[PDB]
Amino acid sequence: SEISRVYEAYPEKKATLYFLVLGFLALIVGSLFGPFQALNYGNVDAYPLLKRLLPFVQSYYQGLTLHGVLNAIVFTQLFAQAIMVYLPARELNMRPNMGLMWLSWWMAFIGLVVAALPLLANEATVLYTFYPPLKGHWAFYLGASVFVLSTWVSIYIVLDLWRRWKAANPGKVTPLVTYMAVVFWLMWFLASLGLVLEAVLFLLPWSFGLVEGVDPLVARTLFWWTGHPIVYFWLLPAYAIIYTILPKQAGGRLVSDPMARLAFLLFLLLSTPVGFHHQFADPGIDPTWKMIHSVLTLFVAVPSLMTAFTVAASLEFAGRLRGGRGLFGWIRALPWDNPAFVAPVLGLLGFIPGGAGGIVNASFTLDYVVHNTAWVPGHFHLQVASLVTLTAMGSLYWLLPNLTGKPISDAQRRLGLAVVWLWFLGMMIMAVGLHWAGLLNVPRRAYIAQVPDAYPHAAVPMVFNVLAGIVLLVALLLFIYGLFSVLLSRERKPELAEAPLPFAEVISGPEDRRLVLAMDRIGFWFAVAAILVVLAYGPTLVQLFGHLNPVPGWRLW
Amino acid sequence: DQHKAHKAILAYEKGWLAFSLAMLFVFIALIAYTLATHTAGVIPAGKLERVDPTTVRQEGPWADPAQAVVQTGPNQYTVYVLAFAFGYQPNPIEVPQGAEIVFKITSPDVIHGFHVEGTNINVEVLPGEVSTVRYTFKRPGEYRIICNQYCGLGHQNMFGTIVVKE
Amino acid sequence: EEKPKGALAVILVLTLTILVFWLGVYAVFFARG
Ligand code: HAS
Ligand code: HEM
Ligand code: CUA
Ligand SMILES: [Cu+]
């Protein structure tokens, strides 16, 4: 059948790849509006240009929407069904089932494709949060509905591949990568009901025309169930990558197996019971629970902290191995010639400011300082346009060989970082701007270019955003040339491809085994996780479900 | 170095979880110090106070914008703010200085914000619910009201004023 | 050898930016009391 026995030995590189292509396409299109939306916050109107290049756009806010669905829902979703199946699958030399594994990919193309339409046609300009009563063509709600449900097929693929292993390595622990994704797909299933009970019972009949109204307090409470974990649905993949992979491409080893397990363990507990941080400014939602979720939210920042230690430690150990030496001698010992290794390490620098961000935001009342200002678009860009994205972009160089064949000549190695270093610097410059205007009260989510006399104390951050627009346009464009060029010029030469992708390995101890053994109560911790949700959203969700107060729809563009 | 090294990690790790879990409660704590003093009123009312958005600009204290600063204590003043597809009723809102404004806001159409600029007042306003907050402007003048919530293409243009009379 | 000097220099900073941020903010909260 094949002049590439490539997809008969293993076609987990036949499915996955289509995941990442779709992914890295969504990230290109949606990111497309980026620096346009960038100069807006820079106080220069760019849309007269953009509307004419792509003549299909009508609002600033329509782009805002493309950029939002196509970067944050589609691109991150895809990149996790990629990694989060492919890796464990390989760390076990097992093939994921392929009715299902090919079905899930149809779900995503089917979905996005259906949605994409309204969205281009400006029939659905309600933004990636799509807050009723802003009402979006029935066809959009069906998009996310299936597309996001495509994460239900894949949960299986993993958990299938869990069952079969331990039916054949029975009485052996769970190998790390697998152990990670297991909980991750379980956690994501706890979160995946939020938006799913919201789509089904409310969104769909409404937008279908089977009710004139929805209750937008509950409409946004189900969203925020799903809508927080979903950031940690975007993160943990790059965490996965950084835990198991990074230390290798970077010359070294995972300093602890179980720290890394623990880190994920607390992410299936605390990823979901934490929606009110986003609902701080709602009415009708008791002050007490805002406090709860706020304590809880600070809890969920405790994984990423030790991560901060376990990772930096690794790179440190690795740094010394390459005769790094000075207090900081360890840093330049790192493979700063390698995009594989640069993108997520710059990811993690980035992660620091963006880190504290979350925590300011996370403390109840300190949200009233920053909430809905541009401060927000500051924090998340730092976290997800930057870390998750760079970790993804950078994955090009070890994943895409492993997957197609096609090695990466010194030229690619050059573009490589030209892209990455421009990306980062862009994300850093755009960071201070967005974060600063944020404190001078420039609202987020706004076409502020059309009122370019209104934020006169933004004068200067403003510049920062202008500049970051130029920078990051320069870097998108290299990325296109460096995406289509590491794919399409023809080195589908034989050998290399085949692999264990560089896993790293671990340091070991006495203490390990006792701990590693307790974190394997997957059914058990799935329970406290599911005790925790029901304990926290339950006593509020009951309430409002009794004062369901539906109000009419609205188109308003 | 190497399995030896590994031990030292597992106690540093421990310091990290120790020190770090700490400063977090300091925060949980500091928060609670705000949580018990005047600056706490900018926190939306507990209760649902339900309304019927499609009627509220026609009947209810939100119908007449002229009589929407109702005195309510010797120093309390309820304001009935309405926040609609594309401004604030009323423009402006005049309140006295040194005194307790209890804002009560609602939507007749879609969602809006109401971030009274220079203050903590910063609340999502939802059709058919009544967002309710306390504030005291201790020092008077003009305060612009920005809508920080997308609500369609009037959005980047939705402002209004608080005048607080010297 | 002996010391994770580095990894802390990293968290020390990670801490000092959590502090600068949180404390900086807090005060804006209050400056807007
Ligand atoms: C993918 C992405 C995201 C991650 C990850 C993320 C992490 C957090 N966030 Fe967030 N966020 C909030 C709180 C947090 C907290 C407490 C964390 C925590 O999980 C983060 C803990 C992180 C740290 C403690 C940093 C650890 C640092 C590390 C690990 C770097 C180490 C560097 C090394 C090791 C380098 C070493 C190498 C060398 C070479 C030196 C809150 C408040 O509670 C809001 C509400 C704002 C509002 O008003 O709407 C919010 C709003 C958002 C929104 C806006 C949603 C919307 O559009 O309406 C998005 C998209 C988002 C994404 C993400 N966020 N966030
Ligand atoms: C090319 C570089 C990028 C630039 C210049 C950029 C710029 C911006 C700006 C200025 C905003 C604020 C818009 C507003 O508040 O009105 C924004 C929103 C957003 N960006 Fe990006 N961005 C970039 C890349 C990315 C990437 C790679 C992701 C994927 C993780 C992403 C995800 C988002 C999301 C989820 C929003 C919020 C949507 C909303 O407000 O409803 N961005 N972007
Ligand atoms: Cu009302 Cu934006
Ligand atoms: Cu969140």
Distance of alpha carbon A506 from alpha carbon A439, whole angstroms: 44
Q: What are phi and psi of A84, to 5 degrees?
A: -55, -10
Number of residues written out for chain A: 557
Tell me, what CATH number does A269's domain have?
1.20.210.10
Most distant CA pair in chain B: distance in Å? 77
Sign, Cα dihedral of B106, B110, B115, B121? positive
**Beta-sheet pairing, B159-165 with B141-146:** antiparallel
Asked if the C-beta of A373 comes within 8 angstroms of chain B's C-beta atoms, the answer is yes
- Chains with ≥3 CB–CB distances under 8 Å to B: A, C
**Contact C19/A352 with Cβ under 8 angstroms?**
no
- 3 state SS of B55: helix
Distance of alpha carbon A351 from alpha carbon A391, whole angstroms: 12
Q: Which two tokens stand for residue A139?
A: 């066809």
Query: In the sheet that B141-146 helps form, which strands lie side by side, from edge to edge?
Result: B93-96, B159-165, B141-146, B115-116
List all residues 6 or more positions away from A280 whose beta carbon is below 8 Å from its beta carbon. Answer: A290, A364, A367, A368, A371
Helical H segments across A210-286, by residue range: 216-227, 229-240, 246-249, 257-270
**Contact B2/A321 with Cβ under 8 angstroms?**
no
B27 is catalytic: no
List all residues 6 or more positions away from A540 whose beta carbon is below 8 Å from its beta carbon. Answer: A221, A285, A286, A289
- 3 state SS of B84: strand
- List of chain C residues whose C-beta atoms are within 8 Å of the C-beta of residue B12: 4, 7-8
Asked if the C-beta of B122 comes within 8 angstroms of chain C's C-beta atoms, the answer is no
Helix, strand, coil tally for chain A in percent (to 5) = 70, 0, 25
Distances (CA, A) of C21 to A360, A465, B39: 7, 21, 20
Q: Which two tokens stand for residue A289?
A: 């629970």
DSSP code of residue A443? B
Number of Cβ within a 10 Å radius of residue B29: 11
Asked if the C-beta of C24 comes within 8 angstroms of chain B's C-beta atoms, the answer is no
In which element (H, E) is residue B12 found? helix B4-35
List all residues 6 or more positions away from B101 whose beta carbon is below 8 Å from its beta carbon. Answer: B77, B79, B95, B134, B135, B136, B137
List all residues 6 or more positions away from A445 whose beta carbon is below 8 Å from its beta carbon. Answer: A64, A127, A372, B148, B149, B150, B155
Q: Report the Cα A201 to chain-centroid distance in Å.
A: 26
Atom in ligand 2 nearest the alpha carbon of residue A386: 27
Distance of alpha carbon C31 from alpha carbon B138, whole angstroms: 12
The method recorded for this entry reads X-ray
- 3 state SS of A427: helix
**Beta-sheet pairing, B141-146 with B115-116:** antiparallel
Give per-residue burial for A370-385: e unless 16+ CB within 10 Å, then b: bbbbbbbbbbbbbbbb
- Looking at the structure of chain A, the number of domains it has is 1
Distance of alpha carbon B135 from alpha carbon A304, whole angstroms: 37
DSSP code of residue B163? E
Cβ-defined contacts of A493-500 (< 8 Å, 24+): A493/A405, A493/A406, A493/A407, A494/A405, A495/A405, A496/A401, A496/A405, A496/A407, A497/A6, A497/A13, A497/A401, A497/A402, A497/A403, A497/A404, A497/A405, A497/A406, A498/A9, A499/A90, A499/A402, A500/A90, A500/A91
Instruction: Note the resolution in Å, 1 decimal.
Output: 3.0
Distance of alpha carbon A42 from alpha carbon A167, whole angstroms: 58
Q: Is B136 in the pocket of ligand 3 (CB under 6 A)?
A: no
Q: Is A72 in the pocket of ligand 2 (CB under 6 A)?
A: yes
Q: Which ligand is nearest to the CA of A194?
A: 4
Of all protein residues, the one whose alpha carbon is nearest to atom 1 of ligand 3 is B112
Distance A220 CA to ligand 4 centre (A): 13
Of all protein residues, the one whose alpha carbon is nearest to atom 31 of ligand 2 is A385
Cβ burial, residue B99 (10 Å; 0-12/13-18/19+): middle
Q: Which two tokens stand for residue B116?
A: 């009274």
**Contact A282/B44 with Cβ under 8 angstroms?**
yes
Distance of alpha carbon B30 from alpha carbon B9, whole angstroms: 31
Amino acid at A99: G
**Contact A100/A174 with Cβ under 8 angstroms?**
no
In which element (H, E) is residue A342 found? helix A339-362
Breaks in chain B listed by the residue before each, with C–N > 2.5 Å: none
Distance of alpha carbon A111 from alpha carbon A147, whole angstroms: 5
**Contact A41/A460 with Cβ under 8 angstroms?**
no
**Contact A280/A367 with Cβ under 8 angstroms?**
yes
Active-site entry in A33, A147, A444, A479 = A444
Q: Which two tokens stand for residue A462?
A: 């403003």
- List of chain C residues whose C-beta atoms are within 8 Å of the C-beta of residue A370: 25
Active-site entry in A381, A424, A479, A503 = A381
Q: Is A38 in the pocket of ligand 2 (CB under 6 A)?
A: yes
User: Nearest 5 degrees, angle CA A539-CA A135-CA A538?
Assistant: 5
**Contact A338/A397 with Cβ under 8 angstroms?**
yes
B159 is catalytic: no
Distances (CA, A) of B103 to A239, A373, A443, B54, B72: 44, 21, 21, 21, 12
Distances (CA, A) of A140 to A119, A137, A252, A255, A368: 7, 6, 46, 45, 32
Give per-residue burial for B117-128: e unless 16+ CB within 10 Å, then b: bbbbbbbbbbbb
Are C22 and A366 a contacting pair at CB < 8 A? Answer: yes
Of all protein residues, the one whose alpha carbon is nearest to atom 2 of ligand 3 is B155
The parent domain of residue A368 ranges over: 1-557
**Beta-sheet pairing, B159-165 with B93-96:** parallel
**Beta-sheet pairing, B76-84 with B87-89:** antiparallel
Distance of alpha carbon A249 from alpha carbon A244, whole angstroms: 10
Distance of alpha carbon A234 from alpha carbon A79, whole angstroms: 8
Are C25 and A370 a contacting pair at CB < 8 A? Answer: yes
Q: Which two tokens stand for residue A315?
A: 């790179």
Rg (CA), chain C: 15
- Chains with ≥3 CB–CB distances under 8 Å to C: A, B
Helical H segments across B36-78, by residue range: 53-56
Amino acid at B91: N
Amino acid at A426: G
**Contact A445/A64 with Cβ under 8 angstroms?**
yes
Distance of alpha carbon A366 from alpha carbon A443, whole angstroms: 16
What would the DSSP string read from start to end of A80-128? Answer: HHHHHHHHHHHTTT-PPPHHHHHHHHHHHHHHHHHHHHHHHTTS--STT
**Contact A280/A291 with Cβ under 8 angstroms?**
no
Q: What are phi and psi of B142, to 5 degrees?
A: -95, 130
Per the DSSP assignment, residues forming a β-bridge with A360 are: none
**Contact A551/B54 with Cβ under 8 angstroms?**
yes
Number of Cβ within a 10 Å radius of residue C24: 12
List all residues 6 or more positions away from B166 whose beta carbon is below 8 Å from its beta carbon. Answer: B97, B140, B141
List all residues 6 or more positions away from B152 whose beta carbon is below 8 Å from its beta carbon. Answer: A61, A134, A554, A556, A557, B85, B86, B110
Cβ-defined contacts of B20-24 (< 8 Å, 24+): B20/A302, B20/A305, B20/A306, B21/A302, B23/C15, B23/C18, B23/C19, B24/A298, B24/A299, B24/A301, B24/A302
Sign, Cα dihedral of B21, B27, B32, B35? negative
Sign, Cα dihedral of A532, A533, A536, A538? negative
The reply, when asked if residue B6 is annotated as ligand binding, is no
**Contact B113/B123 with Cβ under 8 angstroms?**
yes
Sign, Cα dihedral of A109, A115, A118, A121? negative
Going along chain B from its start, the domains and CATH numbers come out as 1-44 (1.20.1070.10), 45-166 (2.60.40.420)
Per the DSSP assignment, residues forming a β-bridge with B88 are: B83
Number of Cβ within a 10 Å radius of residue A232: 24
Number of residues written out for chain C: 33
Give per-residue burial for B5-19: e unless 16+ CB within 10 Å, then b: bbeebbebbeebbee
User: Nearest 5 degrees, angle CA A94-CA A99-CA A104?
Assistant: 95
**Contact B4/A285 with Cβ under 8 angstroms?**
no
Give per-residue burial for A401-423: e unless 16+ CB within 10 Å, then b: bbbbbbebeeebeebbbbbbebb
The reply, when asked if residue B3 is annotated as ligand binding, is no
Per the DSSP assignment, residues forming a β-bridge with B136 are: B100
User: Nearest 5 degrees, angle CA B103-CA B126-CA A272?
Assistant: 115
**Contact A256/A307 with Cβ under 8 angstroms?**
no
Distance of alpha carbon A46 from alpha carbon A40, whole angstroms: 7
CA nearest to A27, candidates A86, A67, A84, A87: A67
Helix, strand, coil tally for chain B in percent (to 5) = 25, 35, 40
Atom in ligand 2 nearest the alpha carbon of residue A388: 30
Q: Which ligand is nearest to the CA of B84?
A: 3
Distances (CA, A) of A299 to A208, A411, C25: 40, 45, 20
Half-sphere exposure of A197 (CA within 13 A, CB side): 17
- List of chain C residues whose C-beta atoms are within 8 Å of the C-beta of residue A355: 14, 17-18
Distance of alpha carbon B5 from alpha carbon A252, whole angstroms: 13
Which among B43, B130, B157 has the least Cβ separation from residue A287? B43
What would the DSSP string read from start to end of A507-522? Answer: ---SHHHHHHHHTT-H
Q: Is A239 in the pocket of ligand 2 (CB under 6 A)?
A: no
A contact set with C (CB within 8 A): 305, 308-309, 312-313, 315-316, 319-320, 327-328, 330-331, 352-353, 355-357, 359-360, 363, 365-366, 368-370, 439
Cβ burial, residue A427 (10 Å; 0-12/13-18/19+): buried
Distance of alpha carbon A239 from alpha carbon A184, whole angstroms: 11
- 3 state SS of B146: strand
Are A352 and C14 a contacting pair at CB < 8 A? Answer: yes
Distance of alpha carbon A82 from alpha carbon A20, whole angstroms: 6
Q: Judge if the upstream peptide bond of residue A539 is cis by omega within 30 degrees of 0.
A: no
Number of residues written out for chain B: 166
**Contact A255/A507 with Cβ under 8 angstroms?**
yes
| Inter-axis angle of helices A98-120 and A74-90, nearest 10 | 170
Atom in ligand 1 nearest the alpha carbon of residue A311: 34
